[PDB]
From a paper:
The envelope of HIV-1 and, particularly, its most conserved region, the transmembrane protein gp41 which mediates membrane fusion during viral entry into the host cell, has been for decades a target of extensive efforts involving structural and biophysical research, drug design, and immunogen design. Purification was optimized for the (CCIZN36)3 peptide (called 3-H throughout this paper) that exposes, in a stable manner, the complete N-HR internal trimeric coiled coil of gp41. In this study we describe the structures of the complexes of 3-H with Fabs 8066 and 8062 in which one molecule of 3-H was bound to three Fabs, as well as biophysical properties of such complexes.
These two Fabs were structurally almost identical, differing only in four residues located in their CDR H2 (I53L, T56F, T57A, and N58V for 8066 and 8062, respectively). Comparison of the interactions of the CDR H2 residues in the two complexes reveals contacts between four pairs of residues (F54/L565, T56/I573, T57/Q575, N58/W571), that are unique to the Fab 8066 complex, as opposed to two interacting pairs of residues (F56/I580, Q64/R579) unique to the Fab 8062 complex. However the fact that Fab 8062 shows no neutralizing activity clearly demonstrates that, in the context of an intact virus, the pre hairpin-intermediate cannot adapt to Fab 8062 as easily as to Fab 8066, making this mode of binding not biologically relevant.
Residue numbers in the entry:
A (entry chain H): 3 to 52, 52A, 53 to 131, 141 to 218
B (entry chain L): 2 to 190, 193 to 208
C (entry chain A): 2 to 67
Write the structure that this text describes.
Amino acid sequence: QLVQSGAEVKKPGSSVKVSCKASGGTFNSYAFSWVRQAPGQGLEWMGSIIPLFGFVVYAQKFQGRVTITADESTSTAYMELSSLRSEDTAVYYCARYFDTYNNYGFANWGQGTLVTVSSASTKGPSVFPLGTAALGCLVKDYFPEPVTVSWNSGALTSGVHTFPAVLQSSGLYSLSSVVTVPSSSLGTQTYICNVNHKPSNTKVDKKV
Amino acid sequence: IELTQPPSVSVVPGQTARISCSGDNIPYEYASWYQQKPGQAPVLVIYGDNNRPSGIPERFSGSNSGNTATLTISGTQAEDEADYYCASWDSMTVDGVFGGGTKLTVLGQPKAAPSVTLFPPSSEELQANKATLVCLISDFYPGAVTVAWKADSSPVKAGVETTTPSKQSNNKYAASSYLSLTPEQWKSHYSCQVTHEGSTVEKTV
Amino acid sequence: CCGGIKKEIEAIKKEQEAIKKKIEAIEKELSGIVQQQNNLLRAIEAQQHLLQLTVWGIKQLQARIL
């Protein structure tokens, strides 16, 4: 149903617009709210719009900096935070409610949007490849979060295990991923892991 | 209006778990409970009175008395270990307000040894003066481990960054450790003393 | 015994076949009513969702203002 725009990096003082295209019903009978979650902390309700009426209510910590808008022609609600500081670095959620008349709870959520507020440079990733047997993949010296490793451009699920990234003292991230196969499926299928670092917009593969 | 939850709650499997949500006037039907496993979006489990969205197990119950709402879980399973939030709407300002959240920790999770893998530098890397070592640590509990290094029989202090453990795909924990090198160092000798709960394990080749 | 039995059979077929027809036209009014009823059902459910949405809208409006 809900799907939000990609992760982003914003310089301190900049602005950011986050989209959230809904799908699967009448858009004017929706109610929307924007919830954010700082890394490691709980959820924080920012605002709420009802597309039918075309106006918003904001939590007073956000009054002025945040602007929310829907767009019935595109079935999409927007969140825009301005005057950015590092305490706004969080995953931003699109959350719809009033699934039914008496359901005031947020029934549907988006996937989330990792917004990173940083005055540092966006460096791209450096990709290196790696009684059963199992192989892997490596992503090193990038910034910032996140990266998502795919396998075979989709054909995998039954044995994939992506690991969290390390934070070097240089201020860069390094990430690893692995899988599993029978040792009789060696030269049976050629393999490719897709590594996308959307902030720097890097789409690179690598075979083993 | 505000909502107070216990920061953490722990219970033994099979027995019920109760998470309280304290606030002044939490209207009535405006209340909600959400479940949030690690890297996911929250999941509405109970809304308003005692309503489960179609798809939520019957073991989840919602209750209210005075100023406290309470999510109840009959016969708690190990896969219910997650961060639980309550939320509502202000009857005055119509502001949405979340609780602090409650980490549910299901007890009795058996001790687990790490399934450790070690990958050496690649045939593409060392053509740029590096060269990088890894260390992959999967399926261990409790999630707490110190990774000691050995440059063949001798420890290494400098140049070691290792990740803090984190809740895995299942309910166990995982982590990883790093140490880059040079072609002026690698092709001239490694082990990985990953130590947790006594069971010290090492890898090579 | 007989004699009268001959005529009596005729009427207790006619009057009791016009009943058959009388019945099939009732079952047809029935299905048309069940139909119309379910339409009002979805009509009302669409109404109460809109109502609740507007009640919520005024709530947010007065707060944004007062």
